[PDB]
Every structure is written in C-alpha cells, then in structure tokens.
Amino acid sequence: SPFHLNDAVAIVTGAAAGIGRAIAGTFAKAGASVVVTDLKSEGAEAVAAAIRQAGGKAIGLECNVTDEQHREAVIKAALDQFGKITVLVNNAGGGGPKPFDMPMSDFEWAFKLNLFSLFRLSQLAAPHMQKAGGGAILNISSIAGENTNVRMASYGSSKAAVNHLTRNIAFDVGPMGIRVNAIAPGAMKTATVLTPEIERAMLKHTPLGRLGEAQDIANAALFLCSPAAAWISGQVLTVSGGGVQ
Amino acid sequence: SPFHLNDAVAIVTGAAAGIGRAIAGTFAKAGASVVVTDLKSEGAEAVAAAIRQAGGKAIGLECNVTDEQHREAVIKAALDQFGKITVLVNNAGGGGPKPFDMPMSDFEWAFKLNLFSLFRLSQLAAPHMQKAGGGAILNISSIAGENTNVRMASYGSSKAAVNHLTRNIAFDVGPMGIRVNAIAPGAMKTDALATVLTPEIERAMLKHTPLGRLGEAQDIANAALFLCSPAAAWISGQVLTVSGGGVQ
Numbered sequence: 200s201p202f203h204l205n206d207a208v209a210i211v212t213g214a215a216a217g218i219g220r221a222i223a224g225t226f227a228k229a230g231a232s233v234v235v236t237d238l239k240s241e242g243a244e245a246v247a248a249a250i251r252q253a254g255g256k257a258i259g260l261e262c263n264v265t266d267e268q269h270r271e272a273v274i275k276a277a278l279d280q281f282g283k284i285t286v287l288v289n290n291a292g293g294g295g296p297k298p299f300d301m302p303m304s305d306f307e308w309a310f311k312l313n314l315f316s317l318f319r320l321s322q323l324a325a326p327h328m329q330k331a332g333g334g335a336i337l338n339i340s341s342i343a344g345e346n347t348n349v350r351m352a353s354y355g356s357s358k359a360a361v362n363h364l365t366r367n368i369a370f371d372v373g374p375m376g377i378r379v380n381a382i383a384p385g386a387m388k389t390a391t392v393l394t395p396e397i398e399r400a401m402l403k404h405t406p407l408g409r410l411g412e413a414q415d416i417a418n419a420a421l422f423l424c425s426p427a428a429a430w431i432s433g434q435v436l437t438v439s440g441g442g443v444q
Numbered sequence: 445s446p447f448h449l450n451d452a453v454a455i456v457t458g459a460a461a462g463i464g465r466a467i468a469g470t471f472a473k474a475g476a477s478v479v480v481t482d483l484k485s486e487g488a489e490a491v492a493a494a495i496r497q498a499g500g501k502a503i504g505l506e507c508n509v510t511d512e513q514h515r516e517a518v519i520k521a522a523l524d525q526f527g528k529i530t531v532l533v534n535n536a537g538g539g540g541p542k543p544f545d546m547p548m549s550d551f552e553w554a555f556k557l558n559l560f561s562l563f564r565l566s567q568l569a570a571p572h573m574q575k576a577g578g579g580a581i582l583n584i585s586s587i588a589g590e591n592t593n594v595r596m597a598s599y600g601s602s603k604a605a606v607n608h609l610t611r612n613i614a615f616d617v618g619p620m621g622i623r624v625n626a627i628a629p630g631a632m633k634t635d636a637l638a639t640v641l642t643p644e645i646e647r648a649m650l651k652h653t654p655l656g657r658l659g660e661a662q663d664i665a666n667a668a669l670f671l672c673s674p675a676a677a678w679i680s681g682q683v684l685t686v687s688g689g690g691v692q
C-alpha cells in the first residue's frame with residue numbers, strides 16, 4: 200500500500216487548526232516525522248503535542264511564513280531535529296473578498312502571504328530534498344485560483360499564480376527528484392461568516408450536496424505527497440464537491 | 445464599421461517602442477487621442493510626435509508602472525488634456541528566464557512590474573472611465589501565463605496572475621460600463637528582439653509553431669484595436685492569445 204510517508208520528514212506551515220492541523224495529523228499518522236509550524240506557536244506546539252500523544256513524531260514551531268528569518272529557522276530546525284527534509288506542505292495563507300478599490304497594502308500582502316511565502320520556502324527546502332534523493336512540495340491553493348467573480352481581485356489573482364507556479368517549478372525541481380502539486384479546496388467547515396440561509400446558497404451549484412471537511416483536503420494531501428502520487432507533478436487537484444461555493 | 449476608437453482617450457503605458465508603440469501608434473489612426481507613455485520620457489514624447497505628425501492627437505509623458513507618483517500623474521495629465529479616460533492599455537511589463545534559486549528581489553519585482561502596477565492604474569482610471577459612460581482596459585500577458593517550462597517561475601506565475609486578474613476584475617468594473625481583456629503574445633520579432641535573434645534560433649522557435657512565422661508588433665496591435673473598439677463590445681474577461689497556434 201503506497202499511501203504512507205514512512206521515513207519522511209514533512210514541514211507543514213500553518214498547521215495549528217483547520218487544514219494545516221489536519222494535514223499535520225494525517226501525515227504524522229502516515230509515518231512522517233512532522234515539523235508542525237504556525238504563526239501561533241502554542242497551538243502549533245499542541246498539534247505537535249497531540250501527534251506525540253498518538254505515538255507520532257513531531258516538534259511544534261513558530262513560523263510566520265512571511266518572515267524570511269522564520270523560514271530559515273524552520274528549515275534549519277527540521278534538519279536539526281530529524282536529519283532531513285523530504286516533504287513540505289505550504290498550507291499557510293488565506294484570503295477573502297475585497298473591493299476593486301481596495302487598498303494596496305491589502306493587495307500586495309496577499310501575494311506575500313499566499314505566494315512569496317511558499318515560493319521562498321520551496322527554494323529553501325529544494326536543495327535538502329535533493330540530497331535525500333527526492334521530495335515533494337504541496338501548495339494549498341483555492342477554487343478562487345480557477346473561478347471568476349466580483350470582489351475577487353486579490354484573492355483570485357494570487358492563488359492563480361500559485362497554481363501556475365506549481366505547474367512551472369515542477370519543471371525546475373523535477374530533475375532534482377521533486378514533485379510539485381497543488382490542492383485547490385472549496386469551502387470548509389473550519390464559520391463566523393456561515394448561516395443556514397447562506398448555506399443553501401453555497402450548496403446550490405455544489406453537486407455533491409455538502410460543504411467540505413478538512414480531512415477532505417488532508418486526505419488529498421496524503422495522496423499527492425505519498426508514493427501513490429509518485430509520477431504525478433505539475434497538477435492542481437480541486438476538492439470542492441464538483442462545484443463552487 | 446466598429447473597429448474604431450473615435451473620440452476615445454487611451455492611456456498606454458510601456459509604449460516607447462515595439463508593441464506598446466504600435467498599440468499607441470495604431471490606436472492613433474483609429475481616431476483615438478493617445479497618451480503615449482513609457483519610463484523613458486523622451487521615448488514617449490518622440491512617439492506622440494510622430495503620431496501628431498502623421499495626423500493624430502497624442503501627448504508624450506513619463507510613467508514608471510512601478511511608481512505611484514508616476515501613476516497618479518498619468519491619470520490627471522490625461523484628463524487635463526482630453527477630459528476623460530476611455531482606454532487603459534497596460535502594455536508596460538517585463539520578464540524572462542530566471543533560475544529557480546533566483547533572489548527573491550527578482551521574483552517580487554516581476555510581480556511589481558507585471559501585476560501590482562497594472563492593477564493600480566486600473567484602479568485609478570476606473571471611476572474616470574465611469575464618468576465617460578464606459579471604456580476598455582487591456583492588459584498584455586504572455587504565453588508564459590498558460591505555458592509551463594523550466595526557469596519560468598517569476599515570469600510565468602506573474603503573467604498567470606495578470607490573466608486571472610483580467611478574468612476577475614471584469615466582474616468589478618463590469619457594471620461600471622468597463623470591460624477587461626488581456627492578450628498573451630507569443631514571441632514578437634521587434635527591433636529589440638531582432639538584434640539578439642538569429643536565423644538558426646528563429647528556426648528553432650518556429651518549428652512547433654503551426655503558422656510558421658514570428659509575431660510582429662502590429663499583430664498584437666490589430667488585436668488590441670479590436671479588443672478596445674466596439675467591435676468587441678460584448679467581449680470581456682478574455683485572454684486572447686496571439687501566438688500563431690503554438691508556443692515559442
């Protein structure tokens with residue numbers, strides 16, 4: 200069975216709750232010594248603490264992916280704690296609706312959080328993954344990187360670059376032994392903006408009939424970073440119930 | 445005929461030579477009042493001059509897409525001269541091969557140069573186009589934006605961003621009577637490119653191109669005139685790809 204991560208070291212950025220927290224637990228159960236990592240270092244310690252409870256291998260760290268210094272620390276910490284880096288899940292990020300006349304700080308920040316971050320980390324992680332003989336990079340994109348809508352300037356155009364970054368950098372680090380893929384999630388039960396009348400709307404145009412649950416992405420991350428996705432690269436697997444939200 | 449820009453006002457960044465030249469040069473003969481702009485200040489003026497020379501209305505001005513001072517200056521300086529804004533051609537842009545380990549300074553700059561700026565100017569002209577009833581914004585992408593190859597991270601993902609921005613902000617300025625399009629151009633045999641091109645490379649770039657010739661700056665401009673004129677009045681959000689059916 201190829202859906203495992205035996206003898207693997209995985210950084211997961213942004214993994215204190217939600218998808219990150221989920222990818223972390225799932226990779227740790229898959230057999231990977233997880234470097235849990237978030238901006239809020241205590242929940243990051245808890246997720247890594249939790250994985251330790253269940254018999255897993257993990258250390259929990261602080262890392263504002265937007266902080267170059269933090270990136271180089273996390274990268275250094277992983278090697279100092281597990282000896283190698285073979286998997287990186289760039290899940291930290293975010294976004295939302297903004298007006299067309301939004302302030303640019305909001306704008307440029309999105310490409311710092313959602314793109315600049317994960318590209319730089321991929322740069323820092325790449326040569327180590329090479330030494331191990333190969334690795335895998337997973338960028339958590341969004342359905343906004345595909346979709347087309349009002350008030351979607353920043354959140355849309357940012358995450359569409361992360362897709363198309365994923366497509367191309369595969370050609371760069373492919374030769375070093377590295378796969379690069381992307382998961383574009385739909386809406387996830389992760390809630391302050393949710394109400395049952397918006398729900399039926401969100402559930403319109405969603406063929407599978409439900410919103411998402413973070414183990415949905417987490418399950419897809421395991422696949423795309425495991426040997427079951429061993430010849431897969433340059434891709435963007437959209438997990439959104441057959442629809443938009 | 446609807447392939448015209450009669451009594452329109454077009455801010456056209458990056459327009460001192462090559463493409464942006466032929467855009468601003470073509471929009472001229474299409475009865476447009478052009479604001480020829482480029483980061484060389486003489487370069488824009490020299491072009492507005494030949495336009496005025498051949499029959500046109502055009503003022504030469506200096507703008508650095510990646511400079512806010514220059515952006516707010518171009519909106520007003522066009523308005524003060526023609527009253528209104530009806531066309532914004534964000535032809536100013538850049539990029540090319542870059543190794544994977546490139547310095548983050550290079551990576552950010554291509555976004556500053558290709559996205560952020562474009563987006564900002566188009567924030568600016570959008571309520572002034574709204575006064576004139578409506579207009580057309582045009583971005584210049586690149587086949588880097590859909591294509592995938594080695595050393596394309598900065599060049600490729602940024603134009604990609606440009607593209608899907610075009611796809612999304614058209615829902616925003618779409619009710620303001622504005623339409624957003626973009627063109628991904630293939631390789632354009634310009635004067636700049638010719639001087640570092642060669643027949644043996646050109647033959648390489650061209651095999652796997654079905655039409656069998658390089659692009660030329662007018663080919664982008666013909667498409668730019670169509671996309672900005674009423675002859676595409678119900679066309680918006682689009683990313684038209686002028687590359688002869690292939691990649692280069």
Ligand SMILES: NC(=O)c1ccc[n+]([C@@H]2O[C@H](COP(=O)([O-])OP(=O)(O)OC[C@H]3O[C@@H](n4cnc5c(N)ncnc54)[C@H](O)[C@@H]3O)[C@@H](O)[C@H]2O)c1
Pocket residue numbers: 212213214215216217218219236237238239262263264265290291292293294312313339340341342358383384385386387389
């Ligand atoms: N959850 C969704 O509905 C949804 C939908 C589409 C796309 N996404 C994508 O998933 C990713 C995150 O989804 P989410 O809802 O789990 O995220 P979120 O923003 O709700 O936060 C999840 C975790 O990310 C951490 N985090 C936030 N900023 C960080 C930073 N600068 N550095 C490190 N960690 C940080 C938080 O501490 C938190 O534990 C984003 O990249 C987003 O584009 C999510």
Ligand SMILES: NC(=O)c1ccc[n+]([C@@H]2O[C@H](COP(=O)([O-])OP(=O)(O)OC[C@H]3O[C@@H](n4cnc5c(N)ncnc54)[C@H](O)[C@@H]3O)[C@@H](O)[C@H]2O)c1
Pocket residue numbers: 457458459460461462463464481482483484487507508509510535536537538539584585586587628629630631632633634636637
């Ligand atoms: N082969 C091609 O020419 C080709 C192919 C695909 C896409 N494009 C796109 O066309 C656009 C540029 O065309 P080009 O290749 O002739 O570029 P270029 O560099 O050859 O010249 C374009 C003009 O833009 C001006 N310029 C440069 N930086 C500027 C700035 N910060 N502000 C304002 N003006 C500036 C330059 O002076 C130049 O005259 C870019 O968006 C590029 O991505 C070009």
